[PDB]
Design a protein around this ligand. Structure first.
Ligand SMILES: Nc1ncnc2c1ncn2[C@@H]1O[C@H](COP(=O)(O)OP(=O)(O)OP(=O)(O)O)[C@@H](O)[C@H]1O
Ligand SMILES: [Mg+2]
Ligand SMILES: [Mg+2]
Lengths: 457, 356
């Protein structure tokens, strides 16, 4: 609707208690995605390892105690604060806040702290930047208003409404950099409500850079967030070791009952024991922390290494989908070599002679003038110049009849397939020009890796 | 608990110099029924909104109260609070004032501009408005200064009674009052005045004096609140120093391999000024081949090291254009660190010399 919360009642004292209403603070698409199974899912000894390594807190002690202490001193005391969380994308920022709210929910049932409402608002999970006001008003009040009516309703509710008929609201501002607009009106309104007395709103902002309010936001929004900021340090090499071992605690160094007929494994017919080498975990967690320290990257390396070992185990036996399996360091090293490799070098080495001649002609023009901007008319003149080098010899004239006449006397001497092929591959560039002679051609890839492919032919 | 009420915390402390100047503007506009506009500026943190909200909540058709004149009289004064940033359009600021003054039982009229708002205040009663943050009313020079110029002319002509008190952020001109920032002695009095309702004070007189001078009001509240959460998580004079230190260091947190690439990034920007990511990778490879130490890295993995310096706050990567003949869009690399601290951390290991 269009009527805000300021016109719902008559006066301030006329507003009843919102906690006794069967509509405030939250007071059908899981049945269509179900089907009957007419077979049997054969799970091998490597199926349980991949499922436990998925993304669905021993390395976070000081960060978990700082967020829990900031909310415990505001919910019980009936106050409002702002918690800032910044760090590398993939260090357990949202999981740490989710564990704090989950721990506070168990303490509220023990008649220790007052009841609160957890609201999860994600900036990247919204189409429009102004859609965050409709989601917050629907989870607190329960109505469905527009972006203009929900903005004025939250201001009137977080100010004139007293604390005796209110309730604590914990809002997790996921993806803080996604709600950054031009007018900076949504970011300022979400931080100004925490500075009010009759608010009782807990805002936990989660971003990716510590200098976000000092670069995008101004001095007015930065003064409302707070000087104390929690920096989420990335995981090192000794912290990622216990992460993988915790997910595979009951699976590592354990015996299984793998069947020799189908290949079904039963966690406690052969007694196949699954053991993962400790050296493969140290060499994998050290490479992840040396790049960015992503928590999901450390779990994807062990999952990819187990997938490669499962492919060779099923192919050598002939199982299907329907003595001791040891994952060595070769499967882990092959999982990290498929990503760090560069397929641009091997791509130019498998091209045809027409595609290889266009790259060799472009590199030769750069060593003569040195401008990194050769026109299309210069490449055509340089290609014909290399053909007429040894035209009197019979060994070179065999290719001139195909590149200019295709082995036909009726076809005249020619002057598009290899040009547009390198453009879509992200290797060659071409400016928007209607002419086919003065159109400059630039290289997108490096120059050192381009000369290695021409010498390999 | 005394630690729960301390973290949660009509004359404001350290503001008697500006409180009397604000009340003096209303002594000549309500008593004489004259329209005038007021302008209040100052940096954020001077307590401008807390000063205006305290006057309305003390000494002050819906929204009707009574104001006490210095000589002793009674008048119908209507005071409202309307924020400029809490609106949808800056041109629709005249409609919000009508909804905050006219009663809901009467007919609701539509206001378009000045001609529809001046006729309503002609029969009437002192209408007091508090327009917070008037700097956002401009349309981001002729068409920009339109809402401010229209609202200033509405509170200048006679025959009506409309006052305007705005709080901006740092012959018919408004009275400009610059809000002075709080110093060391000004921030110390507000702390004792705000925490005067508490029975026991667990703070030390020497700890508040350090936080008051180092923060020179919103920044001081975050410092005192952080000391309570830290002390309660581990179980004074040293409690105030831990809040300013917990919120050369960015270099020691990196590895030896990341320091070699970082040393070559600033080296390429000195002999070539403007450089890109493609040119910085070629300079780093040719610099480590003469020394024959450490294995080189491919161009695909070169961006992984630069991403660590960008997240920590040492290398800024932007998107600009070129200056030569091929002026195309390319990714340029830049830094934002000091040269004094850079030539002092890598020299302590005594293992690299030509790379600096
Ligand atoms: N101690 C831990 N042990 C195991 N997995 C962890 C641990 N901490 C975090 N994770 C994993 O981190 C993953 C990402 O967590 P989260 O949602 O907080 O991400 P983030 O740090 O905000 O960054 P991003 O989601 O953008 O990569 C989760 O799926 C979770 O499995
Ligand atoms: Mg996240
Ligand atoms: Mg203010």
């Amino acid at each position: 609707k269009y009527t805000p919360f300021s016109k719902r009642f008559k006066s301030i004292a006329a507003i009843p208690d919102l906690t006794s209403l069967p509509e405030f603070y939250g007071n059908r698409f899981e049945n269509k995605l179900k089907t009957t199974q007419k077979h049997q899912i054969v799970e091998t000894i490597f199926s349980k390892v991949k499922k436990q390594l998925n993304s669905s807190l021993p390395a976070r002690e000081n960060e978990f105690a700082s967020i829990y202490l900031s909310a415990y001193s505001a919910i019980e005391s009936d106050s409002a604060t702002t918690i800032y969380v910044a760090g590398t994308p993939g260090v357990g920022k949202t999981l740490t806040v989710r564990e704090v709210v989950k721990e506070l929910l168990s303490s509220s049932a023990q008649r220790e702290i007052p009841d609160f409402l957890y609201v999860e608002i994600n900036g990247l999970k919204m189409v429009k930047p102004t859609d965050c006001y409709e989601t917050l008003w629907n989870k607190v009040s329960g109505e469905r208003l527009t972006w203009a009516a929900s903005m004025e309703s939250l201001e009137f509710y977080f100010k004139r409404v007293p604390k005796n008929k209110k309730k604590t609201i914990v809002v997790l501002l996921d993806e803080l950099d996604a709600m950054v607009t031009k007018s900076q009106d949504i970011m300022y309104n979400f931080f100004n409500w925490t500075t009010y007395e009759n608010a009782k709103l807990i805002v936990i902002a989660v971003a990716n850079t510590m200098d976000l309010p000092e670069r995008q936001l101004g001095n007015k929004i930065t003064s409302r967030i707070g000087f104390t900021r929690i920096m989420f340090t990335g995981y090192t090499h000794e912290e990622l070791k216990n992460i993988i071992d915790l997910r595979l605690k009951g699976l590592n160094d354990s015996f299984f009952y793998v069947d020799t007929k189908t290949g079904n494994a039963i966690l406690i017919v052969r007694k196949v024991r699954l053991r993962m080498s400790a050296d493969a975990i140290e060499i994998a967690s050290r490479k992840v922390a040396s790049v960015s320290g992503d928590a999901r990257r450390a779990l994807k390396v062990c999952k990819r290494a187990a997938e490669i070992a499962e492919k060779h185990y099923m192919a050598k036996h002939g199982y299907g989908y329907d003595g001791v399996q040891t994952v060595h360091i070769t499967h882990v090293m092959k999982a990290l070599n498929e990503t760090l490799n560069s397929h641009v070098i091997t791509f130019m080495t498998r091209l045809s002679f027409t595609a290889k001649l266009f790259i060799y002609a472009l590199l030769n023009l750069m060593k003569k003038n040195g401008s990194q901007e050769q026109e299309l008319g210069d490449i055509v003149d340089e290609i014909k110049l290399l053909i007429e080098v040894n035209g009197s010899n019979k060994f070179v004239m065999e290719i001139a009849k195909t590149l200019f006449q295709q082995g036909s006397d009726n076809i005249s001497e020619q002057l598009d397939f290899v040009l547009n092929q390198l453009l879509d591959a992200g290797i060659l560039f071409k400016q928007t020009m209607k002419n086919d002679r003065i159109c400059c051609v630039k290289l997108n890839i490096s120059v050192e890796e381009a000369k290695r492919a021409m010498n390999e032919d | 608990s005394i630690f729960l009420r301390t973290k949660a915390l009509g004359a404001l402390p350290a503001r008697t110099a500006e409180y009397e100047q604000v009340m003096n503007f209303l002594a000549k506009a309500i008593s004489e029924h004259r329209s005038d506009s007021l302008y209040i500026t100052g940096p954020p943190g001077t307590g401008k909104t807390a000063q205006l909200d305290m006057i309305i909540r003390q000494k002050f058709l819906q929204n009707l109260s009574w104001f006490e004149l210095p000589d002793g009289r009674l008048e119908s004064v209507a005071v409202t609070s309307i924020n400029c940033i809490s609106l949808g359009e800056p041109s629709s600021i005249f409609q919000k004032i009508f909804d905050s003054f006219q009663d809901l039982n009467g007919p609701t009229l539509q206001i378009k501009n000045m001609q529809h708002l001046q006729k309503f205040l002609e029969p009437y009663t002192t209408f007091v408005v508090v327009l917070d943050e008037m700097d956002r009313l401009l349309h981001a020079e002729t068409q920009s200064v339109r809402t401010i110029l229209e609202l200033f002319l509405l509170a200048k002509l006679p025959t009506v009674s409309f006052v305007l008190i705005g709080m901006a952020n740092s012959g018919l001109l408004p009275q400009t009052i610059v809000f002075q920032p709080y110093t060391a002695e000004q921030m110390y009095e507000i702390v004792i005045q705000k925490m005067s309702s508490l029975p026991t004070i667990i703070f030390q007189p020497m700890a508040i004096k350090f936080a008051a001078k180092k923060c020179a009001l919103r920044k001081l509240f975050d410092v005192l609140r952080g000391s309570i959460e830290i002390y309660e998580l581990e179980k004074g004079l040293n409690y105030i120093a831990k809040v300013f230190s917990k919120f050369r260091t960015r270099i020691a947190k990196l590895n030896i391999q990341q320091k070699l690439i970082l040393c070559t990034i600033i080296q390429s920007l000195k002999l070539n000024s403007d450089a890109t990511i493609d040119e910085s990778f070629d300079h780093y490879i040719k610099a480590i081949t003469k020394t024959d130490t450490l294995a080189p890295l491919q161009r695909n993995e070169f961006l992984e090291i630069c991403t660590i310096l960008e997240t920590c706050g040492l290398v800024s990567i932007k998107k600009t254009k070129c200056k030569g003949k091929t002026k195309r869009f390319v990714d340029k690399i830049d830094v934002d660190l000091d040269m004094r601290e850079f030539y002092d951390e890598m020299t302590k290991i005594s293992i690299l010399k030509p790379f600096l």
